[PDB]
Design a protein around this ligand. Structure first.
Ligand code: HEM
Ligand SMILES: C[C@H](CCC(=O)NCCC[N+](C)(C)CCCS(=O)(=O)[O-])[C@H]1CC[C@H]2[C@@H]3[C@H](O)C[C@@H]4C[C@H](O)CC[C@]4(C)[C@H]3C[C@H](O)[C@]12C
Ligand SMILES: CC(C)=CCC/C(C)=C/COc1c2ccoc2cc2oc(=O)ccc12
Length: 470
């Protein structure tokens, strides 16, 4: 009716609610939204923060009022990413950002969904995922002959990285390549530092005290930026104007057809490479954890594969639409884990209101996806892993209910690799489960508790076993 300020609990005058958030902000703020509602206010240090919950309220802000909520706060941790010029994390939300986003979407679309000039049956993504799925199966058979057990993340992260690495740099790597493992599987705390609520972003003194976490984050980005440099120079040395091989070339080509510094056009590939390998690897890793902890669910997926395709040919993307129980499992992996509990923090571009509450310009905003995916109002038993909740009586996907699983964001800042992620996750699982069975013996600890971060990881598990099927 009128205009109010967003409600919220009392906080300490110097540190605010930093202690209320604790180690699991997504859980603390979910309980908090049950009491104060979909639009609430807190403080981290002296910085106010508005936290958005509820499915309709978040759609109202990110979509219907999207231009008001399309900004990024000028946090310190973001200034360390891509030399302070990250497309996704810098405070630039004007036309320069929109142009870079438009370069990334077309680069992805051109080298993921487009038809491969070599094969006629499949596209780029399906070709790459098929190759790595085979190498992944062979690599796991070797481990079953030796130690008899393995850590799936150790080898999934390479297979997933080779896919995005072929789309970006036209290269793949061996599962024991020392350079790669040092890059994608050596002290990778990117998600832990960038996760919404990092005290270093709101308590300035923590940035200058002995901080091993922040030191690892600085080294990690310097290492990734050097890798970008190496791959761009190697591409320039062998660049052919009429033969665009990957996304790096389509960006070099755009630097010649030349607002956008050379650096801001090139480092876009790094945002795609870093996001492509980290989030899909975590998604496939979480999927494997659920398959092992819910053998009932693993066999029902295999039964559908045998019925709809059989073991006479490998699965294909065209079969995704006809495997509803596979989609129900992927949707419930996203929903139950919500391994992306918050979007990247947002920021208001101008004074605005939301559900009658005033939010001034420059206000930092958290978007709680975990709250949606676990809302008691929307789901029956939110804490249980039940893929059947997305299935109709006739065995089809309930389109209305699947669209209430929020993990890719909304509006102007939504994920640009959503389709790639959904096709890549589907194919890897379809090819593997058709041929192998994953399991873990009784009596071994398997900690399913998520570890907070931008992308929530699980405790590593060395007790995975894989067996061929009958
Ligand atoms: C299961 C896999 C993935 C999930 C759950 C996921 C989720 C998200 C989320 C929550 C956001 C932020 C939304 C917001 O800030 O409002 C985002 C943004 C983004 N995603 Fe994804 N993502 C996934 C995979 C990928 C892949 C495969 C790519 C590229 C190949 C990618 C590229 C990006 C980029 C570049 C952004 C930044 C958008 C911007 O800053 O404007 N992501 N993603
Ligand atoms: C700006 C970044 C490095 C930033 C950086 O590492 N800053 C550390 C502090 C530097 C490192 C390698 C440089 C590219 C290559 O030279 C190939 C090619 C040469 C052309 O002539 C101009 C275009 C292009 C694509 C160059 C653009 C830009 O100049 C790059 C990305
Ligand atoms: C997960 C959600 C919701 C959104 C992510 C979107 C983007 C753009 C992530 C950028 O990802 C990375 C970058 C970017 C420059 O440098 C990087 C270095 C990295 O190193 C790592 O270990 C893991 C990732 C990583």
């Amino acid at each position: 009716k009128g205009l109010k300020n967003p409600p919220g609990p009392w906080g300490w005058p110097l540190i605010g609610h930093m202690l209320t958030l604790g180690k699991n902000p997504h859980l603390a703020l979910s309980r908090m939204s049950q009491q104060y509602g979909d639009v609430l206010q807190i403080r981290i240090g002296s910085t106010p923060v508005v936290v958005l919950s509820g499915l309709d309220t978040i759609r109202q802000a990110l979509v219907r009022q999207g231009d008001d909520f399309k900004g990024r706060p000028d946090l310190y941790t973001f200034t360390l990413i891509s030399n302070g010029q990250s497309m996704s994390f810098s405070p630039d939300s004007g036309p320069v950002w929109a142009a870079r986003r438009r370069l990334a979407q077309n680069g992805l679309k051109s080298f993921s969904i487009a038809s491969d000039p070599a094969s006629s049956t499949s596209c780029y993504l399906e070709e790459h995922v098929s190759k790595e799925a085979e190498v992944l199966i062979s690599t796991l058979q070797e481990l079953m002959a030796g130690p008899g057990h393995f850590n799936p993340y150790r080898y999934v992260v390479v297979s997933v990285t080779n896919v995005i690495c072929a789309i970006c740099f036209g290269r793949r790597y061996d599962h024991n390549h020392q350079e790669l493992l040092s890059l994608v599987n050596l002290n990778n705390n990117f998600g832990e530092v960038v996760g919404s609520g990092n005290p270093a972003d709101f308590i300035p003194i923590l940035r200058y005290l002995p901080n091993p976490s922040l030191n690892a984050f600085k080294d990690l980005n310097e290492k990734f930026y050097s890798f970008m440099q190496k791959m761009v120079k190697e591409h320039y040395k062998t660049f052919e104007k009429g033969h665009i091989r990957d996304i790096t070339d389509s960006l070099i080509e755009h630097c010649q057809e030349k607002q956008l510094s050379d650096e801001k056009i090139i480092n876009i590939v790094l945002d795609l490479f870093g996001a492509g390998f980290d989030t899909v690897t975590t998604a496939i890793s979480w999927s494997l954890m659920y398959l092992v902890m819910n053998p009932r669910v693993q066999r029902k997926i295999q039964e559908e594969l045998d019925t709809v395709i059989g073991r006479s040919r490998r699965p294909r993307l065209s079969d995704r639409s006809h495997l509803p129980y596979m989609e129900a499992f992927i949707l419930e992996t996203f929903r139950h884990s919500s391994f992306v509990p918050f979007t990247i923090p947002h920021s208001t571009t101008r004074d605005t209101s939301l559900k009658g509450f005033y939010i001034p310009k420059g206000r930092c905003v958290f978007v709680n996806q975990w709250q949606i995916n676990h809302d008691q109002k929307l789901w029956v038993n939110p804490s249980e892993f039940l893929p059947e909740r997305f299935l109709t009586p006739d065995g089809a996907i309930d389109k209305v209910l699947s669209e209430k699983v929020i993990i890719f964001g909304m509006g102007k800042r939504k994920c640009i690799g959503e389709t790639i992620a959904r096709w890549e996750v589907f194919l890897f699982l379809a090819i593997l489960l058709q041929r192998v069975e994953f399991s873990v013996p009784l009596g071994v600890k398997v900690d399913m508790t998520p570890i907070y971060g931008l992308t929530m990881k699980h405790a590593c598990c060395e007790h995975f076993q894989m067996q061929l099927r009958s």
